Design a protein around this ligand. Structure first.
Ligand SMILES: Nc1ncnc2c1ncn2[C@@H]1O[C@H](COP(=O)(O)OP(=O)(O)O)[C@@H](O)[C@H]1O
Ligand SMILES: Nc1ncnc2c1ncn2[C@@H]1O[C@H](COP(=O)(O)OP(=O)(O)O)[C@@H](O)[C@H]1O
Ligand SMILES: [Mg+2]
Ligand SMILES: [Mg+2]
Lengths: 271, 156, 54, 161, 110, 35, 161
């Protein structure tokens, strides 16, 4: 029917316009995210230089684990939240199969929404309003407080984020999070002078905040790139459907004109 | 056809874990047989021979059919299974009443003990031997620890 | 004490298993009887009806 | 099924009871059950008075079972009653026509039989001038007022028909 | 009318967001087999059981079979309530409570 | 062609209506408890 | 070119060889080389025997090189063969008609020359009654069975044709 085809044409044209505008907006936000990712990367990677020079190795036999997953509250990205959820589920499986008591944290509503139906006994806290405004160090500080002011004395942790490689490529990375007992009991830390348990506690708290900040600043850039490419693809597909439906519409309008002519001609020929 | 109406959760509370499937199957067959007794009447409609006396022009075949049918002994099946479940019910009632008398013994002992605890002398007229009689877990293991303080020092 | 009294209540409820079994035996025998009567009726009427139809 | 009949009955209720000027209702090619319902609603609500003849609504009905000629002229009959009330008395009149599309439709149903080449969408060639000669009489003049409420059926929700 | 005004309202509200579990319950309750026209009393009993909450404790998949069983029970030991609904045309608060307790017991046993 | 996505009644108009109804029923529950 | 002939040949292979009764293939307005293929394939597979009376299939062909009268009546000829096998023999018959649409189309081609006012899409006004008269004979009676497989062409992929 001509009216159905016209309805569908108008609908898909609106969809194409909206996805094009969203691609432009994601490009504008990704520019700023990739600009802010340089000093944030220097900061967050200098925060980890100690554990790479002292070669902290974590415990092999400890019991409790804390698994953080970094995502946002916004969709239309692609395989961002799904990658985080797949890694989190795989790691929870591989840890619980080793007897380790695992507790989950989800930064961003999408990861909690994905994992809350199957992994909800193994859950500690989640965080909301991640993605609208760019992440700040205040966000990492708040997450680190509510991870510290929670009473869950973990033995080891991991944080699963989307490390940004390029405009097209991001890779789901995982970083370790050590406890006071892991960095205090290490034999490679005997060369660090003027150290007691209190300074190590303060240092581990600050480094938790730092690794959360670094993960947020990588994930925001990865997600803005993914959303830009996803909206680009959506606009491409909408244009394809628009072309096919325009062909169908022209066909149908020609057929309708011919049918009306034939009706008029057959009415006139019967007189 | 006098049936015993049955509660269907009480039937569930009394089923051990090695015959839950059997209880479910008995329940399903109970419902199936109720439905099937509902979907067929009690007595077949004995058709009058009228439509077969005055509308069959054949030599007595309808008549000999009706004679052979009026005097047919259709086999009524016998129970052969209710007597043994009655015997099993008798045996089970015996075992259950025995266990219940045991439980009443335990209950009278518990009631004696609760009277004993309720009639304790107040704790400020109480010696330490009286406490070791009331709550025997508060007694010093003077065999495992023969020397003072008769307990681990950390316990203090 | 409460637990023991509850155990006694369940023991008192025990008899429904044998009620169920007896119900099923009686109902199966009745279903079989009525199906047999319907079979004999249907065969007799069916042959008489073949005669009347030819 | 969008609410033309319910809305026109609500307008009847409100205005034609807030009015004292000899309303007129013309049922053109619509359901007979609805006509009976409206008749009994008006008898019940005192607008039509079976005894003590002080009613204030005239009814004209040509319904779906009527041939195309009756459904094409019943609107003109109701129009004529309203025209008398407006001109021959000066009164201010209400005219409720449900449904006026049927008028046009009725014409189409005889067009080919009157020897006329069809127009677009199967309508008579004279659709516009017929609608104009019927509609230009439903009007307020200096002689009197005619407030006209017409229900107009839209086939297949087109509005470009 | 009593049961169906509420059922229509809730089905509309479910179509608006397709609460949602009650809506799915009512949808799977509107399904029907072929050549099986139900009596109006049994229809009223089923829509009552579905609109009063007695079906949200069950998963949408099993609803159908429950209905069958339910009907069976109601047409086996509760011909009095069905005859009452049939004769009076409406449900009374007494018969409301009667069918309430019947369906509560059956759901407990189901 | 404003509002043509919802007007076409496709898979995108149904999800638009679902989104509006979800959001505004949440907001109505939030606004009724604070009244 | 979606696979009507492939499907009907698959059905001939899967059902007609395993069939106990007789079979009739009515080629109506189709490719002549397809009829030659079917003939020679049935000879190879022994379903048609050129030397004795053990043949199980009767073929009736009026193909797309035929004028519209032959294309309109060849389906009736095949029906007559199958109807004899169903009634006077009491056999269970298999009747494959490829393509039955041609029947209707052939009627269309003559409908103008017979002096009739065209119906929708230029078809004869008698399309439905002609189709019914033809199709009601393609049936199972309580005198014999006919299982019928009819390939139906869809013009321009329009199922509303
Ligand atoms: N104002 C209204 N309020 C509630 N329901 C209405 C209203 N108007 C119409 N409806 C519903 O839509 C149906 C159609 O009524 P109707 O006035 O006959 O529409 P129409 O005349 O345009 O075909 C009504 O039966 C009613 O169910
Ligand atoms: N079952 C099939 N498997 C593979 N290809 C097929 C099948 N059916 C049809 N085709 C393809 O579609 C083509 C047309 O086959 P055909 O049945 O003669 O078309 P028509 O619908 O006009 O009868 C075939 O040549 C073949 O390429
Ligand atoms: Mg109307
Ligand atoms: Mg072909």
């Amino acid at each position: 029917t001509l009216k159905d085809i016209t309805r569908r044409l108008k609908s898909i044209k609106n969809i194409q316009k909206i996805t094009k505008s969203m691609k432009m907006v994601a490009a504008a936000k990704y520019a700023r995210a990739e600009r802010e990712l340089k000093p944030a990367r220097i900061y967050g990677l200098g925060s980890l230089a100690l554990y790479e020079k002292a070669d902290i190795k974590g415990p092999e036999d400890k019991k409790k684990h804390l698994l953080i997953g970094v995502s946002s509250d916004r969709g239309l990205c692609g395989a961002i939240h799904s990658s985080i959820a797949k890694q989190m589920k795989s790691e929870v499986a591989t840890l619980t199969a080793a007897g380790k008591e695992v507790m989950l944290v989800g930064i961003g509503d999408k990861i909690r929404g994905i994992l809350y139906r199957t992994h909800s006994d193994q859950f500690l806290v989640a965080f909301k309003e991640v993605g609208r405004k760019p992440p700040t160090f205040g966000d990492a500080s708040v997450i680190a407080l509510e991870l510290l002011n929670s009473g869950y004395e973990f033995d080891e942790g991991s944080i699963i984020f989307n490390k940004f490689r390029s405009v097209i490529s991001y890779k789901t990375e995982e970083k370790p999070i050590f406890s006071l007992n892991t960095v205090a009991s290490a034999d490679s830390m005997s060369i660090y002078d003027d150290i007691d348990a209190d300074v190590l506690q303060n240092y581990q708290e600050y480094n938790l905040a730092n690794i959360i900040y670094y993960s947020l600043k990588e994930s925001t850039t990865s997600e803005q790139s993914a959303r830009m490419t996803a909206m680009d693809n959506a606009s491409k597909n909408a244009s394809e459907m628009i072309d096919k439906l325009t062909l169908t519409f022209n066909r149908t309008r020609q057929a309708v004109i011919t049918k009306e002519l034939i009706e008029i001609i057959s009415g006139a020929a019967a007189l | 056809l006098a049936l015993k109406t049955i509660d269907w959760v009480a039937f569930a509370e009394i089923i051990p874990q090695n015959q839950k499937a059997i209880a479910s199957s008995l329940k399903s067959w109970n419902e199936t047989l109720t439905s099937r007794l509902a979907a067929l009447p009690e007595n077949p409609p004995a058709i009058d021979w009228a439509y077969y006396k005055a509308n069959v022009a054949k030599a007595g075949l309808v008549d000999d059919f009706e004679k052979k049918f009026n005097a047919l002994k259709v086999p009524v099946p016998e129970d052969k299974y209710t007597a043994q479940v009655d015997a099993e019910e008798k045996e089970d009632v015996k075992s259950c009443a025995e266990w219940v008398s045991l439980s009443k013994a335990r209950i009278v002992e518990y009631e004696k003990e609760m009277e004993k605890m309720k009639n304790l002398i107040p704790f400020d007229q109480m010696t330490i031997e009286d406490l070791n009689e009331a709550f025997p877990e508060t007694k010093l293991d003077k065999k495992k620890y023969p020397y003072w303080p008769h307990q681990p020092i950390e316990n203090l | 004490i409460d637990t023991e009294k509850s155990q006694q209540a369940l023991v008192q409820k025990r008899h429904y298993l044998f009620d169920v079994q007896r119900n099923n035996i009686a109902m199966a025998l009745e279903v079989t009887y009525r199906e047999r009567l319907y079979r004999v009726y249907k065969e007799v009427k069916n042959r008489l009806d073949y005669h009347i139809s030819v | 099924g969008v609410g033309k009949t319910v809305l026109i009955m609500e307008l009847i209720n409100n205005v034609a009871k807030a009015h004292g000027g000899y309303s007129v209702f013309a049922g053109v090619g619509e359901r007979t059950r609805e006509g009976n319902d409206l008749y009994h609603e008006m008898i019940e609500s005192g607008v039509i008075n079976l005894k003590d003849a002080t009613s204030k609504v005239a009814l004209v009905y040509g319904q779906m079972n009527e041939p195309p000629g009756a459904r094409a002229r019943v609107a003109l009959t109701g129009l004529t009653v309203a025209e008398y009330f407006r001109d021959q008395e000066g009164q201010d009149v209400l005219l409720f026509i449900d449904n006026i599309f049927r008028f046009t439709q009725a014409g189409s149903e005889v067009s080919a039989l009157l020897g006329r080449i069809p127009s677009a969408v199967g309508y008579q060639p004279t659709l516009a001038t017929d609608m104009g000669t019927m509609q230009e009489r439903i009007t307020t003049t200096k002689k009197g007022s005619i407030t006209s409420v017409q229900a107009i059926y839209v086939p297949a929700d087109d509005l470009t028909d | 009318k009593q049961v169906a005004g509420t059922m229509k309202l809730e089905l509309a509200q479910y179509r608006e967001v397709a609460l949602l579990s009650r809506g799915v319950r009512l949808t799977e309750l509107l399904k029907q087999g072929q050549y099986s026209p139900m009596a109006i009393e049994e229809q009223v009993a089923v829509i009552y059981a579905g609109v009063r909450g007695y079906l949200d404790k069950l998963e949408p998949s099993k609803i159908t079979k429950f209905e069958n069983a339910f009907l069976s029970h109601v047409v086996s030991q509760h011909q009095a309530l069905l005859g009452t609904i049939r004769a009076d045309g409406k449900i009374s608060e007494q018969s409301d409570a009667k069918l309430k307790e019947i369906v509560t017991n059956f759901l407990a046993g189901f | 062609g404003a509002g043509s996505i919802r007007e076409a009644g496709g898979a995108f108009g149904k999800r638009e209506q679902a989104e509006e109804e979800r959001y505004f029923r949440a907001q109505s529950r939030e606004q009724l408890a604070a009244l």
